């Protein structure tokens, strides 16, 4: 019936999706025909959102839900077996996604109960789960990964290990991999007036100037900025506001296009304009 | 049974049956939901509003990289552009002589591109002298076929030989101004329209003193011989009889050229001089060519104008921008600053990337000053489009462009790889 | 082929129209069928903008031109004959607009050589006319009414006489009758970058917080509100802006909603939320 | 020879072939151009969002009409209303038992409506006690029947009878919360059940200081004994053996309904009772009858927070939102700002007016303060539909509003004379 979250494999090859029937279906789009390729059934709830590991990892591809279990799906030759399976957290789970490939295959996910599992992948079938309680007051759902920035020797760099993430409270928080071990919160951005629906990390385009959007209940979609690396200023800025919620929002690679969607069952496009203000470029559908 | 979890859920989750949702990917295409999917997922592409014919043909990418000399950065291996000797003038022979692109970039070709005369002489403040004029005069002898049909035509429209002449000298012809100017027995201006195209001062103070007279009572005469005297005067628009009433009928562009002809007010700068006309006149809005002068008029502050400009106007191409930025940036022409040059290189090499030209993306990535920022594009188109920058191409782009031999191999492996599982 | 601007009559019972033929036609609506009733044929060019008088000085509609001419039809049985028509401009008449009908039948009129005549009726067919020159720097686009506000003996109060006007310029000149008997601006408002489109007089809910919206070249909506404590302090506030030109700006009567006409064919609606910003409510086709 | 001017115009004007327009005419409809018009005029209307049917019959405006007494302001002729016995009750009868609003009308109808004795006694620290508990009693008596479903299904599902027990006490059934007591050989309980429905200090203390006892060593006790002797202590959500931990499958209002029977911590205000529950629990998102008690609870800053409240939630209706203040208002029941009162009265009033149903709005604006506002209306709304106010919507409004003699006069003669020309 509806569909939820769905994306796009790298290399654009594949197209994992799922919906409400708790089916996560992975389709091919071969000259642009969508061709399915097999109904990875497995959670006792609807599937939230879906994200795929990073081609240097095989093919990964895991998906959360409501049924408060996590699933990482790998595929061996056609083999699209479960490798692992997680259910750290006690509420469902609004939402995932991957670590920038070069920090290892980490997975960030966002439970409902309020807390924040974070997988790491060792040697062979084996996963620690370094978790985050009470993240959020009343839950979680939006988890983005700021993107992968490296800082005269023979080392792969120490990252600064970020990834913000809104939830029920109306807070954004952001979050840091402390040296020791364990991640803590770095920063509150309490801009929203309402559940903070998604928050994504736009991607540098090697540009320092870092960014971050948000959309919530209240129907505003924020871009918050960081002048200057080091600095821990978070200046939020108003895209437009809405009279309906905002469901999700992501940024177009090169451009850094906002895909925004909310409000009417319509989707708007936005980029900044060489004045600062952000612009609606058109309307989808 | 199964309806009161879908709503408890729905519910419980602030879920309004009016949530959609979309999702940028990889490629750059986006995943709107619409029903026309077999699992209902619209996978609509990025339209490339980039529009001019000739970027989708090997020849140009290929050819117009030979214009080029790459090499390596300093922080790393990755290529940029070392030397490229690219003007305007390479890309008119891809265009056709009737639209407004062959136009704006034939101007630019004739405003920017490089005076370069022949023969070596030793004197050089006659070499600085020449290439001042070639310029002039390439420049006068365009907007003459610009106004030649506006002005030809307009006089067969005349039972009045005085205003034929005047109409001559708007083309610039003095010869046929003249010839008019006897055959009707009005030869005294033959005379004045022979010292027209310099510059002397007797002349100059002997039509001013004269018109000057002319405004007490005896105004016996055709507005025509005045309009010309006036043009003897020097200043013709700033006058005390002034032309600047022809903006009636007249293009812009005809009193510019007048401006550029008999509009001379001391000897210095074309560039300052172009810059005197824009003041006493406002140019057509959305005009390419007229901004083009514009950017040319204002010298030093060139950039900075560019800035302002592009803040209130959609008349400038991506495409060209860039090419404007990058021909004025290495020929010394112009003031372009880093950070204002690969803020427009992303422009382009975006669109071109929409277009899934990677060829092209990636070859305007290499003006990229940004170490760092190169790199991080180029390590990422790469690796994302190599089988699409292989085989059939031209079969060798990459290393055409100096791209790294590890890269090539290390993203390479990686998909033959990833297809290696699909399989 | 294409029209221009179509008002409904007071009374919603007609509709006159006007296109780029020089055809003023005016419809009738009754039961929400269009049926034509008259082409009053006259300009040498366009019509651009029309106005329908108050019924309380029988049935007038005036309409301007691009031929630099004004034109007001009278209607007596039937007879849509012209009573009187007015060329004082040089260039194109680009609108016009109608006094409330207290401060008697006044027609303003806004040219494009930068000039702003006054068309005020007398008992018979005669017309007094004082004018405004070199009003806006390149010519005049808009022109609005502010609405008439009432300021013990037996007197119908003087009023103060206002009307607003955008143009050329950019500059949205407000205006003022000053008790001699001539128009004198009052205050200039620069907040657009290019030409201003359509000044609209929001019409006072009896509350005193007077309004005026514009739209220009530059593609932004103002709503420059203003609380004046006897002097002019007009502060504006960013309704929204596209990537494209907006064309008019018109108010909705009750709750003062702002149809937005411009950008992509589409029209827009908007109302200030009880926040302050304004939201779009709806698109219109 | 003709689409030269138009290019000419349409370019000499900063036209694009964009070019829309649209303008709301006295009736409120908007005119759009689609080419869906003989003449491209798409006169679409503008959309009253007000659902609530009852507002279409003329018996509902008529009947609510003489629950009013109206009288002419300071300031002029124009009627205002003086006098409105208007209560949520009044609305109960047009809608249906079964709807959300039927709910939030009957609830507010319950938490505001005055409660009155039915005889003449006056002691009044006994009548303003009755009345104090009559409102108790009513509203516990309507969430014990918005909580029958949900509880008496619960209990289908029990094999322990004292879990039946500490459910019958929820739904304040003490008289078959009694019987199974005794039936199932668990007398004692059945006696403290009967102190419960009492205010007994010896009780009280027995079971807490009972309670703390039974955290030292002495386990096999059932979580339902426990949970029904903290039912004694007093407050039971903020105890040394809390219920807290309920709300994970009872509807917050099961437990609300618990702070109002057994939670009688302090003998005091029940607005302020309300309120204390508020405080341990978070309520449900988007929910009318939710926000209702907000409003009911906080008291004094009842204006404070109705305007904090409708900051957040549309989930208030406006045709609510009005007869809210307005029954408030007239009633003493709460403190309400005149700036805030007309703020929503216009809102009401206009959507009347989107709707065309005058009559209504006409009404809705003599709740009207600003004499200037009114008036300023009333003339508005009246010049415009005189001939729909007329001859069949019941004959006679208008003289039923206490509206002026001349404006009617006036007005209508301006209109015969209107359609006078048109014939």
Redesign the interface.
């Known amino acids: 019936d ?12 594949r ?1 994992a ?1 799922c ?2 029937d708790r089916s996560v ?1 992975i ?1 091919d ?1 071969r000259n ?1 025909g ?3 390729i097999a109904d990875l059934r497995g959670h006792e ?2 599937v939230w959102q879906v994200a795929w590991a990073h ?2 990892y ?2 990964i591809l895991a998906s959360c839900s ?1 049924d408060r279990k996590v699933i990482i799906w790998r ?3 056609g083999t699209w077996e479960k490798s692992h399976e997680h259910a750290g957290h006690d509420s469902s789970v609004n939402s995932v996604c991957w670590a920038p490939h070069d920090y290892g295959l980490i997975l960030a996910c966002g439970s409902s109960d309020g807390a924040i599992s974070l997988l790491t992948y060792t040697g062979e079938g084996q996963w620690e789960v370094k978790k985050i309680n009470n993240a959020h007051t ?1 839950g979680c759902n939006a988890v983005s990964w700021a993107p992968a920035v490296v800082p005269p020797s023979g080392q792969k760099p120490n990252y600064i290990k970020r990834f913000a993430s809104g939830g029920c409270d109306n807070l954004i928080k952001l979050w840091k991999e402390e040296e020791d071990g364990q991640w803590k919160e770095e920063q509150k951005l309490e801009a929203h ?3 903070v629906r998604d928050v994504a990390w736009a991607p ?4 320092p100037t870092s960014t971050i959007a948000s959309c919530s ?2 129907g505003r979609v924020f871009i918050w900025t960081c002048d200057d690396a080091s600095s821990n200023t978070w200046s939020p800025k108003l895209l ?6 905002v ?2 929002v ?6 850094n ?1 906002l ?1 925004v ?7 708007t496009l936005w980029k900044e ?3 600062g ?1 952000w ?7 | 049974d199964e309806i009161d ?2 709503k408890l ?1 729905m519910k419980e989750r ?1 879920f ?1 049956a ?17 029903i026309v ?8 592409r ?1 339209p490339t509003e980039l529009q001019r014919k000739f970027l989708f043909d090997d020849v140009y990418l290929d050819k117009e990289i030979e214009k080029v000399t790459i090499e390596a950065r300093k922080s790393n291996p990755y290529p940029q552009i070392s030397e490229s000797s690219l003007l305007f003038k390479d890309a008119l022979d891809y265009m056709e002589k009737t639209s407004s692109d062959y136009n704006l970039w034939k101007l630019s070709s004739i405003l920017f591109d490089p005076v370069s005369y022949p023969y070596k002489t030793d004197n050089d403040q006659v070499k600085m002298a020449l290439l001042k004029k070639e310029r002039h005069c390439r420049l006068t002898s365009w907007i003459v076929s610009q106004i030649g049909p506006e002005i030809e035509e307009k006089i067969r429209n005349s039972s009045n030989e005085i205003e034929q002449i005047f109409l001559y000298l708007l083309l610039n012809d003095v010869v046929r101004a003249s010839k008019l100017a006897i055959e009707s027995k009005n030869g005294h201006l033959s005379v004045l329209i022979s010292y027209l195209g310099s510059n002397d001062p007797r002349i100059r103070d002997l039509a001013e003193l004269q018109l000057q007279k002319w405004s007490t009572g005896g105004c016996s005469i055709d507005k025509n011989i005045s309009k010309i005297y006036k043009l003897l005067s020097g200043s013709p628009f700033e006058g005390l009889f002034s032309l600047k009433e022809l903006e009636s009928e007249f293009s812009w562009l005809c009193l510019l050229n007048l401006t550029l002809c008999y509009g001379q007010i001391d000897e210095y700068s074309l560039e300052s001089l172009v810059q005197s006309h824009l003041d006493k006149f406002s140019l057509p809005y959305d005009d390419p060519i007229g901004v083009i002068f514009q950017l040319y008029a204002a010298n030093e502050n060139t950039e900075k104008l560019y ?1 302002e400009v ?2 209130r106007t959609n008349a400038l191409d991506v495409q060209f921008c860039w090419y404007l930025i990058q021909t004025l940036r290495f020929n010394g022409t112009r003031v372009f600053s880093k950070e204002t040059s690969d803020e427009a290189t ?1 422009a382009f ?2 669109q071109l ?2 277009a899934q030209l990677h060829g092209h993306s990636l070859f305007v990535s290499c003006f990229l000053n ?1 170490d ?6 180029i390590k990422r188109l790469v690796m ?1 489009e190599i089988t699409l920058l292989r085989a059939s191409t031209n079969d060798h782009i990459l290393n055409r462009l100096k791209i790294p031999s590890q890269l090539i191999f290390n993203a390479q492996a ?2 033959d ?2 297809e290696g ?2 399989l």
């Open positions: 509806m569909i939820h979250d769905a994306q796009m494999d790298y290399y654009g090859t197209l999706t919906s409400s279906k389709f789009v642009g969508q061709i399915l709830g609807p081609p240097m095989g093919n409501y595929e061996e030759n009343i007036s309402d559940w540098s385009i090697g540009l209940q209240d437009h506001k809405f009279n309906d919620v469901w999700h992501s940024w177009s690679i090169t451009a296009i895909a969607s909310g409000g009417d069952n319509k989707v304009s060489v004045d203000q612009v609606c470029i058109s309307d989808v559908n | 979890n879908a859920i602030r309004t009016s949530y959609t949702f979309a999702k940028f990917s990889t490629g750059s295409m986006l995943l709107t939901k619409d999917g077999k699992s209902g997922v619209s996978i609509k990025l800035k592009r803040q992303f090499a975006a990337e929409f940004d760092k920022a190169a790199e991080d594009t994302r990686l998909k790889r990833y599982n699909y």
